[PDB]
Each structure stands twice: as C-alpha cells, then as structure tokens.
Design an enzyme around this catalytic site. Structure first.
Site, mmCIF file in Angstrom:
data_model
loop_
_atom_site.group_PDB
_atom_site.id
_atom_site.type_symbol
_atom_site.label_atom_id
_atom_site.label_comp_id
_atom_site.label_asym_id
_atom_site.label_seq_id
_atom_site.Cartn_x
_atom_site.Cartn_y
_atom_site.Cartn_z
ATOM 1 N N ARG A 177 11.876 20.127 35.866
ATOM 2 C CA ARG A 177 12.023 21.012 34.707
ATOM 3 C C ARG A 177 11.278 22.334 34.976
ATOM 4 O O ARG A 177 10.331 22.679 34.271
ATOM 5 C CB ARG A 177 11.437 20.329 33.455
ATOM 6 C CG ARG A 177 12.197 19.072 32.975
ATOM 7 C CD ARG A 177 11.517 18.437 31.745
ATOM 8 N NE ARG A 177 10.114 18.119 32.019
ATOM 9 C CZ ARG A 177 9.709 17.104 32.778
ATOM 10 N NH1 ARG A 177 10.595 16.268 33.313
ATOM 11 N NH2 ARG A 177 8.416 16.915 32.989
ATOM 12 N N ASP A 242 6.369 11.584 36.894
ATOM 13 C CA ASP A 242 7.363 12.135 35.978
ATOM 14 C C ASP A 242 8.531 11.233 35.580
ATOM 15 O O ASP A 242 9.634 11.723 35.346
ATOM 16 C CB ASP A 242 7.915 13.435 36.577
ATOM 17 C CG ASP A 242 8.527 14.352 35.535
ATOM 18 O OD1 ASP A 242 9.590 14.940 35.829
ATOM 19 O OD2 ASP A 242 7.935 14.488 34.442
ATOM 20 N N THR A 243 8.304 9.926 35.499
ATOM 21 C CA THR A 243 9.373 9.014 35.103
ATOM 22 C C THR A 243 8.960 8.270 33.828
ATOM 23 O O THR A 243 9.393 8.628 32.727
ATOM 24 C CB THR A 243 9.710 8.007 36.245
ATOM 25 O OG1 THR A 243 8.562 7.206 36.549
ATOM 26 C CG2 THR A 243 10.144 8.760 37.506
ATOM 27 N N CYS A 348 16.820 1.898 41.868
ATOM 28 C CA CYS A 348 15.380 2.123 41.698
ATOM 29 C C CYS A 348 14.472 1.023 42.266
ATOM 30 O O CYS A 348 14.651 -0.160 41.968
ATOM 31 C CB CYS A 348 15.067 2.305 40.208
ATOM 32 S SG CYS A 348 13.322 2.521 39.833
ATOM 33 N N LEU A 349 13.493 1.424 43.073
ATOM 34 C CA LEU A 349 12.544 0.487 43.666
ATOM 35 C C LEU A 349 11.291 0.360 42.807
ATOM 36 O O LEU A 349 10.488 -0.546 43.010
ATOM 37 C CB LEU A 349 12.160 0.927 45.090
ATOM 38 C CG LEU A 349 13.227 0.722 46.176
ATOM 39 C CD1 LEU A 349 12.731 1.268 47.508
ATOM 40 C CD2 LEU A 349 13.554 -0.760 46.299
ATOM 41 N N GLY A 350 11.128 1.259 41.838
ATOM 42 C CA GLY A 350 9.954 1.192 40.986
ATOM 43 C C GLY A 350 10.217 0.568 39.626
ATOM 44 O O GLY A 350 9.332 0.550 38.776
HETATM 45 C C1 MNR Z 1 6.371 5.222 41.776
HETATM 46 C C2 MNR Z 1 7.590 4.593 41.884
HETATM 47 C C3 MNR Z 1 8.668 4.745 41.007
HETATM 48 C C4 MNR Z 1 8.646 4.686 39.649
HETATM 49 C C5 MNR Z 1 7.438 4.364 38.747
HETATM 50 C C6 MNR Z 1 10.028 4.812 39.206
HETATM 51 C C7 MNR Z 1 10.457 4.754 37.865
HETATM 52 C C8 MNR Z 1 11.724 5.002 37.382
HETATM 53 C C9 MNR Z 1 12.007 5.147 35.942
HETATM 54 C C10 MNR Z 1 11.151 4.776 34.896
HETATM 55 C C11 MNR Z 1 11.381 4.914 33.546
HETATM 56 C C12 MNR Z 1 13.134 5.918 35.955
HETATM 57 C C13 MNR Z 1 14.393 5.752 34.757
HETATM 58 C C14 MNR Z 1 13.761 5.797 37.342
HETATM 59 C C15 MNR Z 1 15.112 5.981 37.719
HETATM 60 C C16 MNR Z 1 15.623 5.964 39.061
HETATM 61 N N1 MNR Z 1 14.822 5.717 40.189
HETATM 62 MN MN1 MNR Z 1 12.915 5.050 40.213
HETATM 63 N N2 MNR Z 1 12.805 5.310 38.202
HETATM 64 N N3 MNR Z 1 12.938 5.194 42.284
HETATM 65 C C17 MNR Z 1 11.848 5.077 43.139
HETATM 66 C C18 MNR Z 1 10.518 5.001 42.720
HETATM 67 C C19 MNR Z 1 10.061 4.947 41.396
HETATM 68 N N4 MNR Z 1 10.875 5.022 40.269
HETATM 69 C C20 MNR Z 1 12.300 5.087 44.521
HETATM 70 C C21 MNR Z 1 11.409 4.933 45.749
HETATM 71 C C22 MNR Z 1 13.645 5.324 44.494
HETATM 72 C C23 MNR Z 1 14.612 5.625 45.646
HETATM 73 C C24 MNR Z 1 15.264 4.445 46.339
HETATM 74 C C25 MNR Z 1 16.306 4.871 47.351
HETATM 75 O O1 MNR Z 1 16.657 6.066 47.374
HETATM 76 O O2 MNR Z 1 16.775 4.007 48.120
HETATM 77 C C26 MNR Z 1 14.023 5.397 43.096
HETATM 78 C C27 MNR Z 1 15.311 5.698 42.627
HETATM 79 C C28 MNR Z 1 15.678 5.861 41.283
HETATM 80 C C29 MNR Z 1 17.031 6.286 40.876
HETATM 81 C C30 MNR Z 1 18.272 6.453 41.805
HETATM 82 C C31 MNR Z 1 18.528 7.917 42.131
HETATM 83 C C32 MNR Z 1 19.712 8.138 43.073
HETATM 84 O O3 MNR Z 1 20.601 7.275 43.157
HETATM 85 O O4 MNR Z 1 19.759 9.202 43.710
HETATM 86 C C33 MNR Z 1 16.974 6.326 39.499
HETATM 87 C C34 MNR Z 1 18.130 6.685 38.582
#
Ligand code: MNR
Ligand SMILES: [K+]
EC number: 1.14.15.1
Length: 405
Positions: A177, A242-243, A348-350
């Site tokens: 943002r 930022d998630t 998502c891995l998180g």
């Molecule tokens: C600190 C760790 C993480 C936290 C906490 C977290 C929390 C969240 C969350 C919480 C409300 C939101 C909704 C979220 C949403 C997503 N998230 Mn998540 N996420 N997240 C990752 C780490 C984390 N996320 C990673 C690493 C990937 C990439 C995996 C790959 O590319 O193979 C990913 C990928 C993603 C993607 C796929 C994006 C794409 O296809 O290009 C989405 C959507």
C-alpha cells in the site's frame, strides 16, 4: 491516470477499477471490490488504471488461472508492471518445477511443526496484551494489538530486535500500500540492505532462529545460496508484518458491530475454529496476480503474451455463485468456499501460524472483554492495495462488564 487502451482490448470489457483507491471505498473495502460482481459486469474485464491490466471477477476464473501456471506465470505477480518486474521473492516469483524445492525449507521455519515451538509464547503474549488493555475501557486496536501481537511473535521467531519494527513495517507497507514516497523496487532494496549482513553473519555463526535455518538450509540436497536465502527471508518478513496484522482488525471491527455474533462464540466456544474460517472468507484481503506467457483465449477473451491479470483471492469468497448471501456472516455455513490462502502450487505456507493467531485472539479477547463497541461518532476507514487494511479502529467498553482471568 488512465493508460491508452491496447489494440486487442474491446471497449465493452473496459471497467476502470483502481485497486489502490477504489471508488466505493467508503462503504468498506470488500464492498468496494464487490462492485465488480454486479449484474452488468463481465466475468473478465480490463481496467486502464495502474498501467492497464485484466481482472478476473469470479471464483471459477480465479481458480482456473491459479491452476494453469503454464499460461499464467508468477514471474511478474504484482501490478503495476514496474513492481511485478522488480519482484523476485522465493518461492512466489517462481513457477513449478523450480518453485517446488523451496517450499520444504520455508515449511521448516513457519510450518505446523514450528507453530508447536511457539505455542506457549503465542498464548502468553495474547493474554498479556489483552489484560493490560482491559481496565482501560478503550484502545486503538490497530496499534495496541493488531500490530504488536503478530509482529512481536514473528520477530521472536526470526531472532530480530523489536526496536527494528518501525523501520521494517514502514518498508513492508510500501510494497503493498505505497504512500508514494518509495517505489516497490526502492522498498525491496532497502529490505535487502537490512537482511544482507544478517544472513552472512548467521551463515558464519548459525543460530536456531528462522533466518539461521533458511541461510544454512539445503534445497533438494544442495546448499542454498546467499542470494536465494535473501529472497526467501524477504518474503517471510512481508508475511509476518502485513498479513494477520490487517485481518485481525477487519475481524474485530465486525465483532464490535455485531453483539449477536459475539454472544454466539461466548455461549458455544467450540464454534470458534469454524468462525475463523467464515471470517477469513467474508473479510478476505489479498489480491495479486500473474502474467501471460503467450497469446491465449480465456473464456472467450483474447489475451496477449505480456498482459497482466489480477486474480483477487478476495473475490472468490464473496462470489454469490460460490456462496449464497455472501455478505452475510454465518458461522454455521455448511461449505465455506474461498481462496483466502491462495490456490494451486503456491498455497500459503503460513496458514497454520495465521489460524492459531486468529483463534487465540478470538478466544482470549472475548473471555476478558465480551462487550465492546466502536468509539462514539467514529467512522472506520479502510485502505486498498495488494493487501487491504484498516486505517484505525478506536474501541470502547465498560470495565464493569469485563473479566480478569
Ligand atoms: C510469515 C509467514 C506467513 C504468514 C504469517 C502468512 C499469512 C497469510 C495470511 C494471513 C491472514 C494471508 C491471507 C495469506 C495469504 C497468502 N499467502 Mn501466506 N498468508 N504465504 C507465505 C507465508 C506467510 N503467509 C509463503 C512463504 C507463501 C508462498 C508460498 C509459495 O509461493 O510457494 C505464502 C503465500 C500466500 C498466498 C499465495 C500467493 C500467490 O499464489 O502468489 C496467499 C494468497
Ligand atoms: K519479476
């Protein structure tokens, strides 16, 4: 500003939506994006905003594009194009097959097993922060809980000093943002400027923190490079800062405005996990995309190599074709359909760490402060971007209705 319409794009598919400043933002960010699902809007439209790009507006198309990585590549996943081109995080900027080998390493530092290593600390911090606010009868939720809870947990896991949060959070926000003072590329370089020396120091003298594990890790049997480790750690920082931070504020805003839903989770606490999933559907907040690898006809529309397409992971869940009465929050919803955590090879891995932080917050907050509301005469403002959020959330309550346990 509106970019000139490309030669292959027909006028009847033009809908000038601005992902960084939507027209109906005042009604709520989710409501603002939902305008793309009104009766007169095609499944796939083109906006001249932010350089010009396509936008899939229905779950069916969003899921199809995320599955077909051969036509829709993650090499340039951000809009505007300048940002997508500079974007090189791992594994997000890679397509299978090369992408896959990096997922196992990332799972080692943020996966389920790790959520078990921090179980007690997450619980402790949540209760601690909430008990401190309880007697106050008021709080600025965004800065008093939404930010400190998930962020301090991430800094602990990564072995980084909490005093570095203001700088890191500012940089992360410029990538999702932007306020205009920094381009995506400049923000990314500043993040790498921070990480470079840390990674080298921990490759020399390994620790047990997330950065040490990534920096000394192996990828399908071979040593990871310093450059690869940097690109993976940068992504983890963004996810940690930022998630969940933004999602928690959307959820608490809703609970403050709906006493009925609060009472439901209080009377039947076993429904909290299901409530978490429904809130993730209704208040989805992520929207990134892909780039076309070649000319391709998609659902009757002619796409050209190089065209960018936004696949709002947010839109799938509010699609009436996927969920009846989409704007309504129903914790007893039989089949909660959504792509809040993505779809396809980049799932998502998180999500395990995120769900734990959300469930703990719901349970520990309602246990101590069951009754609360938005501050008198306050008008909650949202902000839109790659990840959307809440600008401020002033809350109030009568301490006499709270419980210190
Ligand atoms: C600190 C760790 C993480 C936290 C906490 C977290 C929390 C969240 C969350 C919480 C409300 C939101 C909704 C979220 C949403 C997503 N998230 Mn998540 N996420 N997240 C990752 C780490 C984390 N996320 C990673 C690493 C990937 C990439 C995996 C790959 O590319 O193979 C990913 C990928 C993603 C993607 C796929 C994006 C794409 O296809 O290009 C989405 C959507
Ligand atoms: K790129």
């Amino acid at each position: 500003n509106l970019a000139p319409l490309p030669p292959h794009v027909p006028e009847h598919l033009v809908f000038d939506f601005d992902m960084y400043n939507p027209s109906n933002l005042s009604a709520g960010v989710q409501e603002a994006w939902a305008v793309l699902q009104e009766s007169n809007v095609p499944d796939l439209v083109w906006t001249r905003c932010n350089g010009g790009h396509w936008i899939a507006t229905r779950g069916q198309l969003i899921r199809e594009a995320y599955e077909d990585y051969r036509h829709f590549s993650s090499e340039c996943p951000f809009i505007p194009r300048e940002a997508g081109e500079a974007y090189d995080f791992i594994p997000t900027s890679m397509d299978p097959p090369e992408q896959r080998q990096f997922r196992a390493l990332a799972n080692q530092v943020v996966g389920m097993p790790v959520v078990d290593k921090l179980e007690n600390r997450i619980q402790e911090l949540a209760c601690s922060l909430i008990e401190s606010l309880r007697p106050q009868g008021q709080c600025n939720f965004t800065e008093d809980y939404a930010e400190p809870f998930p962020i301090r947990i991430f800094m602990l896991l990564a072995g980084l000093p909490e005093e570095d949060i203001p700088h890191l959070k500012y940089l992360t926000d410029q990538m999702t943002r932007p306020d205009g003072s920094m381009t995506f590329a400049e923000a990314k370089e500043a993040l790498y400027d921070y990480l470079i020396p840390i990674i080298e120091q921990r490759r020399q003298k390994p620790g047990t923190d997330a950065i040490s594990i990534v920096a000394n890790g192996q990828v399908n049997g071979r040593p990871i490079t310093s450059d690869e480790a940097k690109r993976m750690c940068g992504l983890l920082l963004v996810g940690g800062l930022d998630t969940v931070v933004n999602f928690l504020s959307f959820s608490m805003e809703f609970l403050a405005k709906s006493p009925e839903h609060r009472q439901e989770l209080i009377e039947r606490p076993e429904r909290i996990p299901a409530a978490c999933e429904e809130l993730l559907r209704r208040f989805s907040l992520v929207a990134d995309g892909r780039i076309l690898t070649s000319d391709y006809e998609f659902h009757g529309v002619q796409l050209k190599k190089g065209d960018q397409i936004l696949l709002p992971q947010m839109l799938s869940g509010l699609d009436e074709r996927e969920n009846a009465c989409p704007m309504h929050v129903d914790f007893s919803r039989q089949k909660v359909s959504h792509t809040t955590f993505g779809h396809g090879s980049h799932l998502c891995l998180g999500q395990h760490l995120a769900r734990r932080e959300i469930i703990v917050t719901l349970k520990e907050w309602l246990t101590r402060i069951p009754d609360f509301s938005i501050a008198p005469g306050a008008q909650i403002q949202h902000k839109s971007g790659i990840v959307s959020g809440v600008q401020a959330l002033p809350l109030v309550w009568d301490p006499a209705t709270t419980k210190a346990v």
